[PDB]
Amino acid sequence: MNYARFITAASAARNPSPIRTMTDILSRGPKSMISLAGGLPNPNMFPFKTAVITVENGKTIQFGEEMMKRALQYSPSAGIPELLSWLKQLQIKLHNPPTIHYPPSQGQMDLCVTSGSQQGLCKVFEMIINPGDNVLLDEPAYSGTLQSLHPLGCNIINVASDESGIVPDSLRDILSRWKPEDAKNPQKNTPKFLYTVPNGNNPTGNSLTSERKKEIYELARKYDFLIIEDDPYYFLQFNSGRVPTFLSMDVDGRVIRADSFSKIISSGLRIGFLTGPKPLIERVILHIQVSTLHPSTFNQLMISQLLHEWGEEGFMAHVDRVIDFYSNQKDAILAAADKWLTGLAEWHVPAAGMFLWIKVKGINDVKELIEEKAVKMGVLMLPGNAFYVDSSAPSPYLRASFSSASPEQMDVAFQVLAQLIKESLLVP
Amino acid sequence: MNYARFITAASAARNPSPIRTMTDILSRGPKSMISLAGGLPNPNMFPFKTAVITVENGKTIQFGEEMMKRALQYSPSAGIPELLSWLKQLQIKLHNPPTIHYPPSQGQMDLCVTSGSQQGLCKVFEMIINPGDNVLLDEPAYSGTLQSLHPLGCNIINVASDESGIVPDSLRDILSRWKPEDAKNPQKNTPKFLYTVPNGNNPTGNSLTSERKKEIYELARKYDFLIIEDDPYYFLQFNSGRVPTFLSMDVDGRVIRADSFSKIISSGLRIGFLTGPKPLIERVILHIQVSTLHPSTFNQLMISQLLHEWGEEGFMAHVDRVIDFYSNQKDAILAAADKWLTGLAEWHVPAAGMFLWIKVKGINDVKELIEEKAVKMGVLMLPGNAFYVDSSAPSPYLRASFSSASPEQMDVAFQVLAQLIKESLLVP
């Protein structure tokens, strides 16, 4: 593969920090070296000395004097080596990517820890998009990506979707405006990428099937575009057995996958990871290097010590317990919607994630009902408008989270929603 | 002031997340509200439960069950409110900025916590720079900013400097190519900003005087450009009672200041802060929102609890102890340079920071001497080339850190240097 045609001139221009050259010759000269090249502050000046963090169904995490000095000090841009190696083994175990042993220039599998999955996505979008570029996605889409894409001046082409996610026939019809050979033509504008959330799409809750993923992949090869697999709900699927990912079928080295620990381990710690072809991951690490420098060393060490103690088994056992909690929350929100919203609204059972996407029946726009009227009654829900490229267009939809509210809180919230819908239905 | 000319079309296009409305309307409706809006995961699912962090010359920091849930959860893009309010009072106490009570559109003082000061600088550079824009700085300059600026396609105009930093007469002469009215002319290209490190410039160690800062400020008003005050060594000045900052004299609302906790509290925690005019800080927060989302909640809570317990007095007492350590390190490196490098090299006493900038006397380029020859002898130092826009140009300079090496380690390193200098002079 040739990755240069996908990236911007600014991304290609990025150079590594001069400290990398010193790090390369660190293991090339003697072992007991004196380093005056560095810019690392003296760790002994830092006021935090030791840390003890208690874990539920796990051994207490302890940072002694030496471990605390490491946790409070600068660390590599791509992430700490022990976290990177554990995550690489996890990706091999779960996805067995065809690119593991490819040459670096051919899209060899590479990983990098990011300050949440949002950072990975943001740096990936900025690395690729020139104004006027064509990108593909299915609307309604995650507001965070629409808000990232909007300032980049790309044309967002909406791909049709249903309860099983993106409709491959719709993607096929959209692509027919070009010929496969246009992808090699510098003056043709074939799509740079397809962006999708394959499990529990935010905000619909819909997931792609294996069959559809294979057809989509086949179209990505034919018209030579990348696939940005934003999969933060991969570890939050309600159905038994995880569906194979785009990364698992990536023979071409065309997939960039974002994984998140936000719903399973911690959202506040800002630790996610990106998996993709080495030349593209390298461009992302270089942009991260001049922005955050690296993700928090302390937070990485907390997560790394937890994952190593748990092992792959302990991690999977924890995700099962988390899925079980969200599955019970999903049943409770579905029972509340059946009770108060039957005949007033329409909804599908979410396949993954923490959201219920609700279509209000006899209202063109739910925005004032949700942003004003519901808030004054003490109930917060998100209007559907936020999940479309054209947010000014009227939306009869709303997104309801089932992550934390109790069944009684859901009962009160849905009773309020029903009351407001009824009020709106009476106004001619 | 009109800030529109200092912001790219992409930066201006940024919109806030839809949850901001849900955060603003939250404080106007009832008190016992039910939220199904936020995409916040259930905190009870997180595996870390409590934390105890020991502090030197301070009370032990403790995160109980409720505080840990907050620390592991999403938090506002600009930072946690208790940290923002403590830092705002610190900025008022230290700098008393003239912009505190200005209307928001006139450059009202605003702050935001960033994932290290590097993130603030990066977002500020990206917010301002269009390809072809002219920017001002004094070389040698921090490699991290040169590496951020390089992909942006701006023309970097070098301003002359000496032991007292930027020479105002040099800035005055450079600016004379334009007329003050050209800053209002869309087709004239007057500099967008002046970037400088006023205390302990990386890599020189030189600091600006009050008199020079006032003259520079006067030129920034005359030609209407911004001042990016990157001041990470503000709390590492060797002289007592700190020089007034550019922020302290910012009557026009033209200063963007970056502060860092990297040398005083922790580099690894990735917590810094930006202070500047509200319309510009707002553009930065919106870019942070689509990238990192927010700085680590856990790390912010650690620092906030430490600062609140210390108070402004406890913080200043800690910085005095840190300065005292670096002052002794500076004396030790100066004594090592006097012993070994007299007649072979030239250096100035650093006014702040942790670096000694050394000019080798009879060599045009020190790169092979430092990257190859010194490394094989077990001594690492940084070649000067990394601190110039044109890094390919020969440099007789080197940067030596005095943050951690012992006096004996400095003696061994400076012996090795003196040996290699003598070797490269006796070569026919």
Ligand SMILES: Cc1ncc(COP(=O)(O)O)c(CNc2cc3cc(Oc4ccccc4)ccc3n(O)c2=O)c1O
């Ligand atoms: C004038 C000015 N402005 C802003 C800042 C950013 O500071 P921050 O974001 O922490 O607040 C600085 C701090 N510069 C240095 C940082 C530094 C970091 C290192 O670890 C890395 C380096 C790269 C990637 C990962 C980890 C090693 C050596 C370093 N050396 O040598 C430095 O000189 C500065 O000097």
Ligand SMILES: Cc1ncc(COP(=O)(O)O)c(CNc2cc3cc(Oc4ccccc4)ccc3n(O)c2=O)c1O
């Ligand atoms: C498909 C997809 N891709 C990637 C990601 C990024 O995930 P991350 O970076 O944590 O790995 C997500 C995560 N989704 C949400 C995050 C979210 C965060 C909030 O707190 C903020 C929000 C803004 C600023 C500061 C704090 C509030 C509401 C939120 N809502 O409503 C969400 O839906 C995602 O759904």
